[PDB]
Amino acid sequence: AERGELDLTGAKQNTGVWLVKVPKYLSQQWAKASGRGEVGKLRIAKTQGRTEVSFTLNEDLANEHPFVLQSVGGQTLTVFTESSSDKLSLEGIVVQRAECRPAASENYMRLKRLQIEESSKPVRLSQQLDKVVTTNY
Amino acid sequence: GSKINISQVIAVVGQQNVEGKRIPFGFKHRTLPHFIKDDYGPESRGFV
Amino acid sequence: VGIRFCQECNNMLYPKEDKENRILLYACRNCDYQQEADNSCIYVNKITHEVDELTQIIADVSQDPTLPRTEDHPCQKCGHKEAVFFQSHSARAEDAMRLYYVCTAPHCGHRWTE
Amino acid sequence: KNVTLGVPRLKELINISKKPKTPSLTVFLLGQSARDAERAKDILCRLEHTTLRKVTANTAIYYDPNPQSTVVAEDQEWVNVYYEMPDFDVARISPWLLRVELDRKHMTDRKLTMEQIAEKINAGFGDDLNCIFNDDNAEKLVLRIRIMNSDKMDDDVFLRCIESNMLTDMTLQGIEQISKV
Amino acid sequence: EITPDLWQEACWIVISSYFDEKGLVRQQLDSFDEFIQMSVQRIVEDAPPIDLQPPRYLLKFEQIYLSKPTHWERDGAPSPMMPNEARLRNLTYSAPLYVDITKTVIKEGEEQLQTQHQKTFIGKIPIMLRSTYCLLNGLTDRDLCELNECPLDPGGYFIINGSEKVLIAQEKMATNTVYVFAKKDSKYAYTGECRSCLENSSRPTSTIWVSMLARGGQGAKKSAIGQRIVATLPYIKQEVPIIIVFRALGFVSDRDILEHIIYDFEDPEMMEMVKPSLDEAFVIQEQNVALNFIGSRGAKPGVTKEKRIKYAKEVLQKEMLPHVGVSDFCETKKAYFLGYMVHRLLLAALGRRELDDRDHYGNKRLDLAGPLLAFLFRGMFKNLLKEVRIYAQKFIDRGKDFNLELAIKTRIISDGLKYSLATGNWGDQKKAHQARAGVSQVLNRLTFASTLSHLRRLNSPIGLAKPRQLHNTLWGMVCPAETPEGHAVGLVKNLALMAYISVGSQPSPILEFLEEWSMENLEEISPAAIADATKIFVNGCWVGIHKDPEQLMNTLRKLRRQMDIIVSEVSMIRDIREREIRIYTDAGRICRPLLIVEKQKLLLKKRHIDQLKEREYNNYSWQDLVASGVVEYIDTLEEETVMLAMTPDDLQEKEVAYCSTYTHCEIHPSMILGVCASIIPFPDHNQSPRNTYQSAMGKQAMGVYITNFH
Amino acid sequence: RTTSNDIVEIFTVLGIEAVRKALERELYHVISFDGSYVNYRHLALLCDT
Amino acid sequence: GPSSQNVTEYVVRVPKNTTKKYNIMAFNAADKVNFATWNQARLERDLSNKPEDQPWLLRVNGKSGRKFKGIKKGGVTENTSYYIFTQCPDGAFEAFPVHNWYNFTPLARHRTLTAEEAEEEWERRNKVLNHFSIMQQR
Numbered sequence A: 001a002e003r004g005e006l007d008l009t010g011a012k013q014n015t016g017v018w019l020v021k022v023p024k025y026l027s028q029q030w031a032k033a034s035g036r037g038e039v040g041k042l043r044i045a046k047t048q049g050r051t052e053v054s055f056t057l058n059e060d061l062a063n064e065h066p067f068v069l070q071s072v073g074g075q076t077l078t079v080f081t082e083s084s085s086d087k088l089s090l091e092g093i094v095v096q097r098a099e100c101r102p103a104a105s106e107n108y109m110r111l112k113r114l115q116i117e118e119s120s121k122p123v124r125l126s127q128q129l130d131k132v133v134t135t136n137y
Numbered sequence B: 001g002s003k004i005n006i007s008q009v010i011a012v013v014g015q016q017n018v019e020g021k022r023i024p025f026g027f028k029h030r031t032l033p034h035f036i037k038d039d040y041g042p043e044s045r046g047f048v
Numbered sequence C: 001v002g003i004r005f006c007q008e009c010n011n012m013l014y015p016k017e018d019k020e021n022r023i024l025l026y027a028c029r030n031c032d033y034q035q036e037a038d039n040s041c042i043y044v045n046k047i048t049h050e051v052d053e054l055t056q057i058i059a060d061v062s063q064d065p066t067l068p069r070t071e072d073h074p075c076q077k078c079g080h081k082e083a084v085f086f087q088s089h090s091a092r093a094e095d096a097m098r099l100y101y102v103c104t105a106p107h108c109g110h111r112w113t114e
Numbered sequence D: 001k002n003v004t005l006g007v008p009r010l011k012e013l014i015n016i017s018k019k020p021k022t023p024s025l026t027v028f029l030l031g032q033s034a035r036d037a038e039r040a041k042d043i044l045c046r047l048e049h050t051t052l053r054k055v056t057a058n059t060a061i062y063y064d065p066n067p068q069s070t071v072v073a074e075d076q077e078w079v080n081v082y083y084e085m086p087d088f089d090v091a092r093i094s095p096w097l098l099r100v101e102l103d104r105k106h107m108t109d110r111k112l113t114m115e116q117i118a119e120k121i122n123a124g125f126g127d128d129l130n131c132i133f134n135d136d137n138a139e140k141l142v143l144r145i146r147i148m149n150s151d152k153m154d155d156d157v158f159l160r161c162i163e164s165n166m167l168t169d170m171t172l173q174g175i176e177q178i179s180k181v
Numbered sequence E: 001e002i003t004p005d006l007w008q009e010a011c012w013i014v015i016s017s018y019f020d021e022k023g024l025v026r027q028q029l030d031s032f033d034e035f036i037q038m039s040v041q042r043i044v045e046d047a048p049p050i051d052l053q054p055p056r057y058l059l060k061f062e063q064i065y066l067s068k069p070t071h072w073e074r075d076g077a078p079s080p081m082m083p084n085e086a087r088l089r090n091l092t093y094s095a096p097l098y099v100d101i102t103k104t105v106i107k108e109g110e111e112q113l114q115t116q117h118q119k120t121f122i123g124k125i126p127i128m129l130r131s132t133y134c135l136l137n138g139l140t141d142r143d144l145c146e147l148n149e150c151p152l153d154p155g156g157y158f159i160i161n162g163s164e165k166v167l168i169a170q171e172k173m174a175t176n177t178v179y180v181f182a183k184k185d186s187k188y189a190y191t192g193e194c195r196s197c198l199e200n201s202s203r204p205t206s207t208i209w210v211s212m213l214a215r216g217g218q219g220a221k222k223s224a225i226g227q228r229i230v231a232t233l234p235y236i237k238q239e240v241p242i243i244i245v246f247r248a249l250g251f252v253s254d255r256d257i258l259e260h261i262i263y264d265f266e267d268p269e270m271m272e273m274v275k276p277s278l279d280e281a282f283v284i285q286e287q288n289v290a291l292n293f294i295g296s297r298g299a300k301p302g303v304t305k306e307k308r309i310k311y312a313k314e315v316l317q318k319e320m321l322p323h324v325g326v327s328d329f330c331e332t333k334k335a336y337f338l339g340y341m342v343h344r345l346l347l348a349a350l351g352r353r354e355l356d357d358r359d360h361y362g363n364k365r366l367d368l369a370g371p372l373l374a375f376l377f378r379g380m381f382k383n384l385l386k387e388v389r390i391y392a393q394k395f396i397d398r399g400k401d402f403n404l405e406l407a408i409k410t411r412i413i414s415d416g417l418k419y420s421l422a423t424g425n426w427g428d429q430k431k432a433h434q435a436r437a438g439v440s441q442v443l444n445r446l447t448f449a450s451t452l453s454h455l456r457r458l459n460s461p462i463g464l465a466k467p468r469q470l471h472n473t474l475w476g477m478v479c480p481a482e483t484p485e486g487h488a489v490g491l492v493k494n495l496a497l498m499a500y501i502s503v504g505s506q507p508s509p510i511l512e513f514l515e516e517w518s519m520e521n522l523e524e525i526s527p528a529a530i531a532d533a534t535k536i537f538v539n540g541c542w543v544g545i546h547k548d549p550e551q552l553m554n555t556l557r558k559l560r561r562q563m564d565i566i567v568s569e570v571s572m573i574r575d576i577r578e579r580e581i582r583i584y585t586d587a588g589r590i591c592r593p594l595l596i597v598e599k600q601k602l603l604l605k606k607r608h609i610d611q612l613k614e615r616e617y618n619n620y621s622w623q624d625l626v627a628s629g630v631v632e633y634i635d636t637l638e639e640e641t642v643m644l645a646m647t648p649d650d651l652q653e654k655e656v657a658y659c660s661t662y663t664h665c666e667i668h669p670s671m672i673l674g675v676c677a678s679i680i681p682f683p684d685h686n687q688s689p690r691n692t693y694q695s696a697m698g699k700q701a702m703g704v705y706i707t708n709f710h
Numbered sequence F: 001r002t003t004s005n006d007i008v009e010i011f012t013v014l015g016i017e018a019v020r021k022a023l024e025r026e027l028y029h030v031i032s033f034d035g036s037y038v039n040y041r042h043l044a045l046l047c048d049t
Numbered sequence G: 001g002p003s004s005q006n007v008t009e010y011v012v013r014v015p016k017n018t019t020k021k022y023n024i025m026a027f028n029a030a031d032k033v034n035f036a037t038w039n040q041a042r043l044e045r046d047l048s049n050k051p052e053d054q055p056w057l058l059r060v061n062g063k064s065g066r067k068f069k070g071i072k073k074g075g076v077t078e079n080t081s082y083y084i085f086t087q088c089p090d091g092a093f094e095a096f097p098v099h100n101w102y103n104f105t106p107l108a109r110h111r112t113l114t115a116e117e118a119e120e121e122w123e124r125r126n127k128v129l130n131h132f133s134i135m136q137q138r
């Protein structure tokens, strides 16, 4: 029992969690939802020799996201916490990695050009004046 | 002039060399991007 | 022929001979971690350098655009009468002009050298 | 093969360059060897400087405290042929063993023999390095090297150092600063 | 459809479209436009705020205001300046440079009353003609003739004191790229060259030298140790081992070190070759002693051990490979790149790769008007900030007030630009010994061909005949024929007809696309799976790996051929034999346009030729042709791994099989020659020394040169 | 009849007159290789001096 | 069986904000770490700088167990967002963005050579004898 001690109850329960990487538009939509309570549905389909994982966007959030699994044995991960009460605790061992890809093949880059334009909106360029400024000195 | 100049004008310019050896491999073991990789033929290595 | 590393401090292992049991004893001298090696080999050096280049060649070199493309000399595991031939072009590793055939099928990759 | 000529050679001759660019040394044979190709080949092999790097196929280091342990799969023959007479075996044999093998192509092409290089190893060093002589009946011309008996730096440092020392210069035959003839 | 036996008209139609849209001096005008638009803004933005004190004073900068080139007469009249008046009166052609000064006052009493000194004049920047920030832009034939300016003049030259000055592009070794070299006579056997710098904004090229120790001192225990690995680091007075530097980044476990160094753990001989360094680094087993060792051998040793700790941390943070990251937490990226650093050196040591050629002109880039003026502006803007700071401190030590109108000196920036663009000494005036000469020669006006040759010219920084030789890498990069006859053979060369030079772009959309397209990021990787995947390089720095090479390359090529978020100037490289992806975005690269061969047919169909044949009254030009995925800008880097066809009707068709996987076709074989060499007809029927002589003498041929000669 | 190309070693083994004769032969060989001939008097002068 | 055509459908929930900040570990599989050793843990600050922008420290079982040092990743999460999906009895997946990613490496626990005496074996630059027994003198 100390301030600097890390709780290890999560590792003793062998809790298994997943790591998901998503593109910026999905995270932006989830931030715009502002935690309403429902952002979408995740679908997991298992066949006789393959596993198919996909995510479905909410129809209210919009107004298919297939998931590709990745090898886990390359490196081991767990999840820890830092509280506002300064009590550190461990959640559990990461057991699976997930990668999110859009279903759009060529119509994705219509929005990607707009996103790059928004990113280059604060990119700053020099301006030309037709008449020289005579208010100096 | 010389008879070698006569031969180069009329029949064949001949094998062309750089620092003694033939044309080296500036690219990934090919003299020019037009020729196929891994070629030591006459046309691909500098012969006219 | 092969090396491994220490366990509890995760350091590089150095050899040691044993005075009592007369067995070679790989050990980390940043530790006291002692173990035997089943290989019983410490050092090998092929000075004439006849390594096997069949494991050296990447299986994806066949799908190169600017490599040659022959029609004869088919592959072994699959028929696929189309293949790529090239040389090693590795400096200081011999002087042979002998050709390295790779099958160009998308899921194959059995490479042979004749 | 060719020698340098022209402006760099003229600069090399008007100067007196302590190292030449491409030095050469034309040799004329005196008598019967001038017309015999075999005797000329003998002189060729006798003037070729042959380091141990060019003639040996590969090297290996093992650990055999028992002479009859025979960690190599096929070494038992000449070990039993030679080790019935324990030449200072009971003092020590330095269990760290050096093993090299000779490429048969480079063995035959240079027209030397395998006993004389072991003789030169035990002669140019003396009794500070034991040598084990094998037979040519085996497919691989294996040579086994062990350290002396009467004596820091453990054993691996000295063994690897002397291994490199054989591998860079022993002058098996020929004369130094002569690359090719 | 397909165009058989009609290639002669079609090729010259599309060359007509290219030369009608671009022209001949776009490598100057585009570079200067990029300098004026991005570079001065990036330089004035990436500058340290002036902090001084007592009340605290802070100064920050903002965007750039520019006007047309005017004149300051004796009475103060701001008359618009014409280039003809600049030539006649020995008058420099320039416009004032305007910023604002955001003066924020802190008196430790919540009295922050920020004042914005709007449109502050800080100096005069030169502008060269026919650029988009000059008076001659947009004028037609009639307006140019009425203004006594030649319409035939391509421009691209500055006017300093009435003398026409043109910037000749100077080549330099390519930044942020790891090389291997083998010095013949040096004590080091092999070496690695990674002359590197940040994204052309902060600090110049700082080099790193990883190298080899040759087999010396044989017979003794030195050969028993083996060939250790050594490097020399910037502002370290002597050499330093490698694993101690790896431990200096905070990675002490040598399993992780060899994991960064070795990617495949079933390679015994390479681990044997790297083993001599492990025996040498057995005296250092902790981070802080490594930092204290590497900091003790600097230029200025510290008084206390904490001083060496701080000096070593600073020199390994702010300077050690600035391009990969300087954000104080980028030690993982530095560890990965420093592993790959000598991973290439070991690959060259075992002979698995070959030694990279120095004069291969795909491994170096060109400093144009843009980068050179950016470097000059960086230097004397630092000088101007130093002058402003010292004047402000001296005048605030009294503590009366402060005024920005007289503190900023336009004199130093004006004479710096004018002097360095006039006399040719590139750099500070007092540092002319270390200043590179030969820049900004006097423009040759004997011949229009001579003028177009002098606008499009390269030069080498060499004061041995190896760099002078004509190289294989040049095919349609640099003209083979044109060479000065005198002492500068090989060094001074002119561009080809289609030699387009990269203007520069930012790699932020590149990273934005590559992160989204199923690529595992560099820090969040399994280090045991590096060897199976393919490395990703964007402007040299390692940003992660990808496990699906051809889908990534096909996606990138499909994005580029459709004018998507990737700029068509940006090039990507697939080295299959090494498993790397190299993507180059930065300026200095040199390129030529090429056709696209898909399956076994060209994408330049009859409809494109028909649209380009009636070019005008149909608003269809070269920029519309590249947007259709017909012509792709393939530079010298992608020429290492593609194929070219000499003629479609003669080679691309089906015959006795030589190849069937062509990727690109030549636009026309006669674009090899430069400006001078083009005017020679039947140059293949001549001898190459005679072509070289006449290309040298084509600049000396008199005649009419510029139409407004009177 | 055995000769060489280097000059310092043939000085250290035979003598300066052998240096004279070998320097003569090497200079004559390097000049008269391409077919251009030069008189012996200048060569003899330079080799003596 | 049922697993040959098993279909799973769960709900994704994102709460707006949590009072307790969440982060993520980084362990190499080649380190061969075990969780049965995890009986008592410490996680405190580094004191070499002398706090949020400063590298981390962690202790296992006091001084008896192994030691780690944590460093924040160099990349910024301006274009990246990582979520952790936790299993709960209600069956609805929870999606939580992480704040920072920290990299940790093990440290040796032995008599390391200090810098003030590290200069004496530099005169034996190539003259060094018996690499295998340098620790024996310490």
Ligand SMILES: [Zn+2]
Residues within 6 Å of the ligand: C006, C007, C008, C009, C010, C011, C028, C029, C030, C031, C032, C033
């Ligand atoms: Zn250990």
Ligand SMILES: [Zn+2]
Residues within 6 Å of the ligand: C075, C076, C077, C078, C079, C080, C103, C104, C105, C108, C109, C110
């Ligand atoms: Zn096959």
